[PDB]
Amino acid sequence: SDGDTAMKAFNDTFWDPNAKMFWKDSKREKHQDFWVEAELWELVMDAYQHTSDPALKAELKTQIDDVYDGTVAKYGQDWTNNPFNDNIMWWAMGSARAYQITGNPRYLEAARDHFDFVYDTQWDEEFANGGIWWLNSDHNTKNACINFPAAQAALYLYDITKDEHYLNAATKIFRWGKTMLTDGNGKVFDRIEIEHGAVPDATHYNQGTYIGSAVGLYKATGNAVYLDDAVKAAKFTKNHLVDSNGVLNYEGPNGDLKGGKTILMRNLAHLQKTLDETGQYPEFSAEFDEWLAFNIEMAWSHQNSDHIVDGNWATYESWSSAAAVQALNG
Numbered sequence: 317s318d319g320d321t322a323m324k325a326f327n328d329t330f331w332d333p334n335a336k337m338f339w340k341d342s343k344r345e346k347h348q349d350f351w352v353e354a355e356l357w358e359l360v361m362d363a364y365q366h367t368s369d370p371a372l373k374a375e376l377k378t379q380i381d382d383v384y385d386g387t388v389a390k391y392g393q394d395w396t397n398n399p400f401n402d403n404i405m406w407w408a409m410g411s412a413r414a415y416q417i418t419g420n421p422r423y424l425e426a427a428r429d430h431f432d433f434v435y436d437t438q439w440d441e442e443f444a445n446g447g448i449w450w451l452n453s454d455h456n457t458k459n460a461c462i463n464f465p466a467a468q469a470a471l472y473l474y475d476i477t478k479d480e481h482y483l484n485a486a487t488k489i490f491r492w493g494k495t496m497l498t499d500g501n502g503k504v505f506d507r508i509e510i511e512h513g514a515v516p517d518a519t520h521y522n523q524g525t526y527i528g529s530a531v532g533l534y535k536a537t538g539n540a541v542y543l544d545d546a547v548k549a550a551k552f553t554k555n556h557l558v559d560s561n562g563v564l565n566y567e568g569p570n571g572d573l574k575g576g577k578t579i580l581m582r583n584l585a586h587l588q589k590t591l592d593e594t595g596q597y598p599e600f601s602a603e604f605d606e607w608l609a610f611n612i613e614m615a616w617s618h619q620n621s622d623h624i625v626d627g628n629w630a631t632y633e634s635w636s637s638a639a640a641v642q643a644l645n646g
């Protein structure tokens with residue numbers, strides 16, 4: 317399977333079985349940044365779910381536990397001292413996913429405790445009638461990269477616990493974010509700052525977590541408006557965050573944005589599966605599938621002799637390189 321070759325290659329190149337972390341790059345000098353490591357954790361979980369190679373599956377399943385243990389060995393179990401609410405929420409979401417796959421109670425405790433800290437203490441209605449602050453150290457801006465991943469984490473917690481509190485939280489966060497952090501037509505704004513107001517800079521990862529939270533709200537509530545919201549955001553992405561040949565942008569040099577295609581592809585796959593299951597937006601579904609297959613082909617054609625694909629699809633770094641592996645594990 318294409319997703320097999322890609323994930324095995326990625327592990328061969330970047331996985332450090334000693335530290336139980338990914339290397340940040342092929343110089344193997346530094347391990348990956350904390351939040352990105354949650355995104356590679358999710359990549360291992362997607363490859364686990366995608367593969368039908370029984371041997372590779374059982375190995376990726378041990379690696380789910382290892383990625384957690386390697387990060388907890390370095391940083392500890394309690395991430396609530398991290399000043400970036402997004403750092404905390406990426407790991408809360410990953411932990412919720414690890415609970416769904418493994419049923420290990422440690423992952424539910426990590427997901428729930430870290431989600432509850434952020435939502436309970438960092439949701440605010442004094443500025444802009446709602447939304448979660450970017451930081452817990454300073455309160456100046458409310459950002460797409462915390463609010464939509466928080467809605468996603470709440471949806472996973474809802475699916476796990478069936479505690480309606482988490483569906484209420486997902487709904488409250490998503491509705492606020494669609495109002496204050498999008499143009500209402502599927503373009504997701506980076507953030508809203510107290511002084512300057514909205515910053516209407518769109519990126520792959522914020523498109524992605526808005527699409528994912530919208531699809532998850534559709535799945536939890538059956539309300540087709542949420543699927544309309546996801547489709548609008550996928551249409552924005554495919555017509556704007558692409559080059560003139562329709563290949564998804566390379567978002568360097570910012571290190572956080574370089575691998576954002578990973579988070580976008582993961583969430584576009586959720587949308588593709590939901591359209592395929594529901595028969596919603598059939599015209600768009602056919603166009604969307606053609607455009608995704610084109611992007612995946614383009615990434616595949618960009619692999620080196622070790623079957624690694626740098627993020628510039630049209631020294632290798634694990635975040636930039638992850639996007640092709642995620643694309644083949646949809």
Ligand SMILES: *[C@H]1[C@@H](O)[C@@H](O)[C@H](O)[C@@H](CO[C@H]2C[C@H](CO[C@H]3O[C@H](CO)[C@@H](O)[C@H](O)[C@@H]3O)[C@@H](O)[C@H](O)[C@@H]2O)[C@@H]1O
Nearest residue numbers: 351400402403459460461506507515517518519570572
């Ligand atoms: C939370 C956590 O993962 C931190 O480790 C990480 O440093 C934070 C980075 O987030 C900030 C930067 C993100 C990228 O910003 C750049 O691109 C934006 C979109 O084009 C521009 O608006 C911005 O000026 C800059 O060029 C940004 O997406 C995020 O909202 C933060 O501002 C992380 O949040």
